[PDB]
Amino acid sequence: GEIEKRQEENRKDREKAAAKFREYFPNFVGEPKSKDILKLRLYEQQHGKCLYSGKEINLGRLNEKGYVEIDHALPFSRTWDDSFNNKVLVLGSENQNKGNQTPYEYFNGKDNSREWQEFKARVETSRFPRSKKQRILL
Amino acid sequence: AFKRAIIFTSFNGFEKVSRTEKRRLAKIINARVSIIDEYLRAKDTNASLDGQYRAFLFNDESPAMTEFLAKLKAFAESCTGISIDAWEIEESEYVRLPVERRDFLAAANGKEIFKI
């Protein structure tokens, strides 16, 4: 039963989430996949803002290819495989200079840049799991 | 169009709200809650319900927003000491507000729907 109980709980969670997704996006073709739901959940968890730029995300355009993307805030040098949850939502036009740097690196943490401070503030007021907030901030 | 139903629930009066009134409110709330907006989850307690803002995302092209508002309003109307105040705000304006006290600010900046 325990496997079956878990299956059924996970079906219920996902139907509920898909239902909202369809409400929001009545013209979307096909059932949302896990990643589609995840863009919506990270949109909510980040208070509707790109985590790297702090720019507002147009929810209307959430499913537009190119527009927003889910990135790994960290490279696999800090997560062998899947020991993390460090997936963040970022606008298309804000995550190319990042390459394989961590956010600490990219945002000039050691200098305590004002943009490092802002990034940190967006992480900490986010609704990400406490542990995710920590991973992200090196 | 995307909008937020901003909801403020408060326990008025010293003739305390019953535990089952709290449960009924938490259920109307939790009907709209999914993994997407897990933070909105309500418990049948003072800590979770009293003096708290919640911001429910809707596409208003759906009849859902009106059904949700209808339930909350009818519920508040059946209660003696649970006050409910509701505002709408466009999502584009909502996400532009500060994160800190966002809902309070959305409540000052939106169109008031009802207050019971």
CSV table of C-alpha atoms in Angstrom, one decimal:
chain,number,residue,atom,x,y,z
A,1,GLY,CA,0.0,0.0,0.0
A,2,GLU,CA,2.7,2.6,1.0
A,3,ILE,CA,3.9,2.9,-2.7
A,4,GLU,CA,0.2,3.0,-3.9
A,5,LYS,CA,-0.7,5.6,-1.2
A,6,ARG,CA,2.2,7.7,-2.4
A,7,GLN,CA,1.2,7.2,-6.1
A,8,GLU,CA,-2.3,8.3,-5.4
A,9,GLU,CA,-1.2,11.4,-3.3
A,10,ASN,CA,1.1,12.4,-6.1
A,11,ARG,CA,-1.7,12.0,-8.8
A,12,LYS,CA,-3.9,14.2,-6.6
A,13,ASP,CA,-1.2,16.9,-6.2
A,14,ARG,CA,-0.5,17.0,-9.8
A,15,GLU,CA,-4.2,17.1,-11.1
A,16,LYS,CA,-4.8,20.0,-8.7
A,17,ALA,CA,-1.7,21.8,-10.0
A,18,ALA,CA,-2.5,21.0,-13.7
A,19,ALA,CA,-6.1,22.4,-13.1
A,20,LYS,CA,-4.8,25.7,-12.0
A,21,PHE,CA,-2.3,25.7,-14.9
A,22,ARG,CA,-5.1,25.2,-17.4
A,23,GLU,CA,-7.2,27.9,-15.8
A,24,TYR,CA,-4.3,30.3,-16.2
A,25,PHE,CA,-3.4,29.2,-19.7
A,26,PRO,CA,-6.6,28.1,-21.4
A,27,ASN,CA,-4.9,28.3,-24.9
A,28,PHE,CA,-1.9,26.0,-24.0
A,29,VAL,CA,-1.6,22.9,-26.2
A,30,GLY,CA,-1.3,19.6,-24.3
A,31,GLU,CA,-1.2,18.7,-20.6
A,32,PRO,CA,1.4,20.7,-18.7
A,33,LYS,CA,4.6,18.8,-17.9
A,34,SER,CA,6.4,18.9,-14.6
A,35,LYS,CA,8.7,21.7,-16.0
A,36,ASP,CA,5.7,23.8,-17.1
A,37,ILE,CA,4.2,23.5,-13.5
A,38,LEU,CA,7.6,24.3,-12.2
A,39,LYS,CA,7.9,27.6,-14.1
A,40,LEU,CA,4.6,28.6,-12.4
A,41,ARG,CA,5.6,27.5,-9.0
A,42,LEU,CA,8.9,29.3,-9.2
A,43,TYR,CA,7.1,32.4,-10.7
A,44,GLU,CA,5.0,32.4,-7.4
A,45,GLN,CA,7.9,31.5,-5.1
A,46,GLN,CA,10.0,34.4,-6.6
A,47,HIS,CA,7.1,36.9,-6.2
A,48,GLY,CA,6.8,37.2,-10.0
A,49,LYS,CA,10.4,38.4,-10.6
A,50,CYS,CA,13.5,37.0,-12.5
A,51,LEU,CA,15.9,35.9,-9.7
A,52,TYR,CA,19.1,37.2,-11.5
A,53,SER,CA,17.9,40.6,-12.7
A,54,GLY,CA,14.9,41.3,-10.5
A,55,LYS,CA,12.9,42.2,-13.6
A,56,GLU,CA,9.1,41.5,-13.5
A,57,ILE,CA,8.1,38.4,-15.5
A,58,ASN,CA,5.0,38.7,-17.7
A,59,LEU,CA,3.0,35.7,-16.6
A,60,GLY,CA,1.0,36.0,-19.9
A,61,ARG,CA,4.3,35.0,-21.7
A,62,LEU,CA,5.4,32.3,-19.2
A,63,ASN,CA,5.1,29.5,-21.7
A,64,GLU,CA,6.8,31.4,-24.5
A,65,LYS,CA,10.0,29.6,-25.7
A,66,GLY,CA,13.0,31.8,-25.0
A,67,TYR,CA,11.1,34.1,-22.6
A,68,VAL,CA,11.9,32.6,-19.2
A,69,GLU,CA,14.0,29.6,-18.3
A,70,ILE,CA,14.8,27.3,-15.4
A,71,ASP,CA,18.5,27.3,-14.7
A,72,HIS,CA,20.6,25.6,-12.2
A,73,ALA,CA,21.9,28.4,-10.0
A,74,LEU,CA,25.0,26.1,-9.4
A,75,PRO,CA,27.1,24.0,-11.7
A,76,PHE,CA,27.5,20.2,-11.1
A,77,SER,CA,30.8,21.0,-9.2
A,78,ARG,CA,28.6,21.8,-6.1
A,79,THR,CA,26.0,19.0,-6.8
A,80,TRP,CA,27.3,15.7,-8.0
A,81,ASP,CA,24.0,14.8,-9.5
A,82,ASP,CA,20.6,15.7,-8.0
A,83,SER,CA,21.6,16.3,-4.3
A,84,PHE,CA,20.2,19.8,-4.8
A,85,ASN,CA,16.9,21.6,-5.4
A,86,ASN,CA,18.8,24.7,-6.8
A,87,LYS,CA,16.5,25.3,-9.8
A,88,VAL,CA,15.7,29.0,-10.3
A,89,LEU,CA,13.5,30.9,-12.8
A,90,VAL,CA,15.2,33.6,-14.9
A,91,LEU,CA,14.3,35.7,-17.9
A,92,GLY,CA,15.8,34.6,-21.2
A,93,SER,CA,17.7,37.8,-21.7
A,94,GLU,CA,19.5,37.8,-18.3
A,95,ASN,CA,21.5,34.5,-17.9
A,96,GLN,CA,24.2,34.2,-20.7
A,97,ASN,CA,27.2,35.8,-18.9
A,98,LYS,CA,26.8,33.3,-16.0
A,99,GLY,CA,28.4,30.3,-17.7
A,100,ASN,CA,29.7,28.0,-14.9
A,101,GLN,CA,30.1,30.6,-12.1
A,102,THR,CA,28.1,30.3,-8.9
A,103,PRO,CA,25.8,33.2,-8.0
A,104,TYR,CA,28.3,34.3,-5.3
A,105,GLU,CA,31.0,34.5,-8.1
A,106,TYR,CA,28.8,36.1,-10.7
A,107,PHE,CA,27.4,38.8,-8.4
A,108,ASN,CA,30.6,39.9,-6.7
A,109,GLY,CA,29.8,38.6,-3.2
A,110,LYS,CA,33.3,39.0,-1.8
A,111,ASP,CA,33.1,42.8,-2.5
A,112,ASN,CA,29.6,42.7,-1.1
A,113,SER,CA,28.3,44.5,-4.3
A,114,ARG,CA,24.9,46.2,-4.0
A,115,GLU,CA,23.8,43.9,-6.7
A,116,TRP,CA,25.0,40.9,-4.7
A,117,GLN,CA,23.0,42.4,-1.7
A,118,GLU,CA,19.9,42.6,-4.0
A,119,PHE,CA,20.3,39.1,-5.3
A,120,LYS,CA,20.7,37.9,-1.7
A,121,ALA,CA,17.6,39.9,-0.6
A,122,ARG,CA,15.5,38.3,-3.5
A,123,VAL,CA,16.7,34.8,-2.5
A,124,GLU,CA,15.9,35.4,1.2
A,125,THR,CA,12.4,36.9,0.7
A,126,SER,CA,11.6,34.2,-1.8
A,127,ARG,CA,9.5,31.3,-0.7
A,128,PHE,CA,12.1,28.7,-1.6
A,129,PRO,CA,12.8,25.9,0.9
A,130,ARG,CA,15.2,27.2,3.6
A,131,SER,CA,17.8,24.7,2.3
A,132,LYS,CA,17.5,25.9,-1.3
A,133,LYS,CA,18.1,29.5,-0.2
A,134,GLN,CA,21.3,28.3,1.5
A,135,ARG,CA,22.7,26.2,-1.5
A,136,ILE,CA,22.0,29.2,-3.8
A,137,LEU,CA,24.0,31.6,-1.6
A,138,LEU,CA,27.1,29.3,-1.7
B,1,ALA,CA,-6.5,39.0,-17.5
B,2,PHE,CA,-4.4,37.9,-14.5
B,3,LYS,CA,-5.6,39.4,-11.2
B,4,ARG,CA,-5.1,38.8,-7.5
B,5,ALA,CA,-8.0,38.5,-5.1
B,6,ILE,CA,-6.4,40.1,-2.0
B,7,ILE,CA,-8.2,38.7,1.1
B,8,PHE,CA,-7.8,39.9,4.6
B,9,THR,CA,-9.4,37.8,7.4
B,10,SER,CA,-9.6,39.1,10.9
B,11,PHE,CA,-11.3,37.9,14.1
B,12,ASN,CA,-13.4,40.9,15.4
B,13,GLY,CA,-14.9,40.7,18.9
B,14,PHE,CA,-14.1,39.0,22.1
B,15,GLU,CA,-17.0,36.5,21.7
B,16,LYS,CA,-14.5,34.2,20.2
B,17,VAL,CA,-15.0,32.6,16.8
B,18,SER,CA,-15.7,28.9,17.1
B,19,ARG,CA,-13.1,26.2,16.1
B,20,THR,CA,-15.5,25.0,13.4
B,21,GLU,CA,-15.9,28.5,11.9
B,22,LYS,CA,-12.1,28.6,11.6
B,23,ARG,CA,-12.2,25.1,10.0
B,24,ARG,CA,-14.9,26.3,7.5
B,25,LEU,CA,-12.8,29.4,6.5
B,26,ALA,CA,-9.5,27.3,6.2
B,27,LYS,CA,-11.4,24.9,3.9
B,28,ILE,CA,-12.8,27.6,1.6
B,29,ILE,CA,-9.2,28.9,1.4
B,30,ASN,CA,-7.6,25.5,0.9
B,31,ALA,CA,-9.9,24.7,-2.0
B,32,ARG,CA,-7.9,27.2,-4.1
B,33,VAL,CA,-4.5,26.1,-2.8
B,34,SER,CA,-2.2,23.7,-4.8
B,35,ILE,CA,1.6,23.0,-4.8
B,36,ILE,CA,2.0,26.1,-6.9
B,37,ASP,CA,0.9,28.4,-4.1
B,38,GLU,CA,1.5,26.1,-1.0
B,39,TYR,CA,2.4,29.2,1.1
B,40,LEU,CA,-1.3,30.2,1.0
B,41,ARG,CA,-2.3,27.1,3.0
B,42,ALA,CA,-4.6,27.8,6.0
B,43,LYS,CA,-4.9,26.0,9.3
B,44,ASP,CA,-7.9,26.3,11.7
B,45,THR,CA,-6.0,28.6,14.0
B,46,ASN,CA,-5.5,32.2,15.1
B,47,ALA,CA,-1.9,32.2,13.9
B,48,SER,CA,-2.9,31.2,10.3
B,49,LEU,CA,-6.1,33.1,9.8
B,50,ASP,CA,-6.3,36.2,12.1
B,51,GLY,CA,-5.1,39.5,10.5
B,52,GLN,CA,-3.6,37.7,7.6
B,53,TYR,CA,-3.5,38.7,4.0
B,54,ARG,CA,-3.6,36.2,1.2
B,55,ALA,CA,-3.3,36.9,-2.4
B,56,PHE,CA,-5.1,34.4,-4.7
B,57,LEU,CA,-4.0,34.4,-8.4
B,58,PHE,CA,-6.8,34.1,-11.0
B,59,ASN,CA,-7.2,34.5,-14.7
B,60,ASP,CA,-10.6,36.4,-14.7
B,61,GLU,CA,-11.5,34.8,-18.0
B,62,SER,CA,-12.4,31.9,-15.7
B,63,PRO,CA,-15.6,31.9,-13.6
B,64,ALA,CA,-13.4,30.7,-10.7
B,65,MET,CA,-12.6,34.1,-9.2
B,66,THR,CA,-16.3,35.1,-8.8
B,67,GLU,CA,-17.1,31.6,-7.4
B,68,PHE,CA,-14.3,31.9,-4.9
B,69,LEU,CA,-15.3,35.5,-3.9
B,70,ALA,CA,-19.0,34.3,-3.6
B,71,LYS,CA,-18.0,31.5,-1.1
B,72,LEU,CA,-15.9,33.8,1.1
B,73,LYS,CA,-18.6,36.5,1.2
B,74,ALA,CA,-21.5,34.1,2.0
B,75,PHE,CA,-19.2,32.5,4.6
B,76,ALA,CA,-18.3,35.8,6.3
B,77,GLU,CA,-22.1,36.7,6.2
B,78,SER,CA,-22.9,33.6,8.2
B,79,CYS,CA,-20.4,34.4,10.9
B,80,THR,CA,-20.6,36.9,13.9
B,81,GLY,CA,-16.9,37.5,14.5
B,82,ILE,CA,-15.0,36.8,11.3
B,83,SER,CA,-14.5,39.8,9.2
B,84,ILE,CA,-13.4,39.4,5.6
B,85,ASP,CA,-12.2,42.3,3.4
B,86,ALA,CA,-11.4,41.6,-0.3
B,87,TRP,CA,-9.7,43.6,-3.0
B,88,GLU,CA,-8.7,43.0,-6.7
B,89,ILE,CA,-5.4,44.1,-8.3
B,90,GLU,CA,-4.0,43.4,-11.8
B,91,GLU,CA,-1.1,41.0,-11.7
B,92,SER,CA,1.3,43.3,-13.6
B,93,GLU,CA,0.8,45.9,-10.9
B,94,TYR,CA,1.1,43.3,-8.1
B,95,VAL,CA,4.5,41.8,-9.2
B,96,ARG,CA,5.8,45.5,-9.4
B,97,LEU,CA,5.1,46.2,-5.8
B,98,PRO,CA,7.8,45.6,-3.1
B,99,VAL,CA,8.0,42.0,-1.8
B,100,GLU,CA,8.0,43.4,1.8
B,101,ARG,CA,4.3,43.9,3.0
B,102,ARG,CA,3.3,43.3,-0.6
B,103,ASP,CA,-0.3,42.2,0.1
B,104,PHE,CA,-0.9,45.1,2.5
B,105,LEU,CA,0.3,47.4,-0.3
B,106,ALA,CA,-1.8,45.5,-2.9
B,107,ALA,CA,-4.8,46.1,-0.5
B,108,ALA,CA,-4.1,49.9,-0.3
B,109,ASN,CA,-3.6,50.0,-4.1
B,110,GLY,CA,-6.4,47.8,-5.4
B,111,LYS,CA,-10.2,48.0,-6.0
B,112,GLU,CA,-12.2,47.0,-3.0
B,113,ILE,CA,-14.7,44.2,-3.7
B,114,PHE,CA,-16.5,43.7,-0.4
B,115,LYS,CA,-16.0,44.0,3.4
B,116,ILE,CA,-18.2,42.0,5.9
